[PDB]
Amino acid sequence: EIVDNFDDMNLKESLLRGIYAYGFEKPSAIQQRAIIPCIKGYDVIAQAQSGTGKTATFAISILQQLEIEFKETQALVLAPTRELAQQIQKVILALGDYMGATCHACIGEAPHIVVGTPGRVFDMLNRRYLSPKWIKMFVLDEADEMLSRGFKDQIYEIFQKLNTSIQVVLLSATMPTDVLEVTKKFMRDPIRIL
């Protein structure tokens, strides 16, 4: 399914409000393919380059699925660097600005979303500063870069701390062997968008 406009995606009013306020008009090719299966809760592998359109894809998907009145961390995003983590927080907070979504960057009240590098997130879990109990969505951004930087084993230990029932969304410009190994381990009949 390709849905070529945001109004036909069954998104919440308050979320669409953030989308139009940000300045988006028409969904990009990745947004037209990926938003729907992400919001339906499927595991998703998306081959996508760095960019706002990519970030807004998983931001929208997370935001649509949040229970805003439940003040617990419901989604966890891993990125290769503190700078990328901060960009993601910035995009998420702009898009969620009309729905009361909270988002903290873990880069060295519980927020709805935490985004950070694998090392910092792993530490936060070990120190009980982040509870895995209510995390329903686990997003791995630029997975190729995280794995090339040597984060595989810390990513695996994080995944081990999360509930069995999570949705996993993995985004990567390239799909090397190591990336494909993670999708096979972490995902169940994933949607593939390559």
Beta strands in the chain (DSSP E): 44-47, 75-78, 103-106, 113-116, 137-141, 167-172, 191-193
Residues 107 and 141: their CA atoms lie apart, in Å, by 15
Contact assessment for residue 112 and residue 68, using Cβ atoms and an 8 Å cutoff: yes
Provide the resolution (angstroms). 1.9
Feature table: binding site for ATP = 48-55
- 193 forms beta bridges with 46
- 139 forms beta bridges with 77, 169
Q: Considering its fold, how many domains does the chain have in total? A: 1
- If phi > 0 it is left, if psi is from -120 to 50 it is alpha, else beta; for residue 138 that is beta
Feature table: binding site = 48-55
Please say whether the dihedral angle defined by the alpha carbons of residues 118, 51, 185 and 191, taken in this order, is positive or negative: positive
Determine the residue type at 148: S
Residues 22 and 108: their CA atoms lie apart, in Å, by 28
Q: How was this structure determined?
A: X-ray
Instruction: CATH number of the domain at 172, please.
Output: 3.40.50.300
Residues 41 and 138: their CA atoms lie apart, in Å, by 11
Q: Which residues make Cβ contacts (< 8 Å) with residue 15, sequence separation at least 6?
A: 60, 63, 64, 95, 96, 98, 99
Residues 4 and 77: their CA atoms lie apart, in Å, by 26
The boundaries of the domain holding residue 43 are 1-194
